[PDB]
């Protein structure tokens, strides 16, 4: 709560911001030059680890 | 045809049926009270895992 008196935009977190990068990352390429989509690739995926193992660790696997 | 001979009455299921002596057992279980009900409760233990791994080729949380 020390960083919510730094800035002035609180954001539902715990994934909700992972799979909305990861959404426009892999369909929309940036740099569509195809050396660097294939580290969007990576990148995208990278997000998705977090939402995905915990609920996964919950009981509802990762892909529901 | 030889059922349908020998019984017109037949139940439905999918393996519910199994969880349905698995359950009916238990309500005896705890009915009928003594030293019978743990080696009585133990074998309604065992019918119910049977469509358990049935849905758990369908994929889903399972045991919830």
């Known amino acids: 709560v020390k960083n919510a008196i730094d800035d002035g935009c609180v954001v539902p977190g715990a994934g909700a911001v992972e799979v909305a990068m990861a959404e426009a990352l892999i369909k929309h390429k940036p740099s569509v030059k195809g050396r660097a989509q294939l580290g969007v690739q990576a990148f995208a995926d990278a ?5 995905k193992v915990l609920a996964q660790n919950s009981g509802f696997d990762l892909q529901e | ?17 199994e969880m349905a002596v698995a359950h009916a ?8 009270t003594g030293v019978e009900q743990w080696p009585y409760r133990a074998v309604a233990q065992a ?4 469509p358990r791994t049935l849905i758990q080729n369908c994929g889903a949380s399972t045991i919830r």
């Open chain 2, 25 to 32: 057992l238990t309500e005896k279980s705890k009915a009928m």
């Open chain 1, 47 to 51: 997000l998705l680890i977090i939402p």
């Open chain 2, 1 to 17: 045809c030889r059922n349908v001979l020998l019984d017109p009455q037949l139940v439905p299921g999918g393996g519910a049926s």
């Open chain 2, 47 to 50: 019918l119910e895992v049977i």
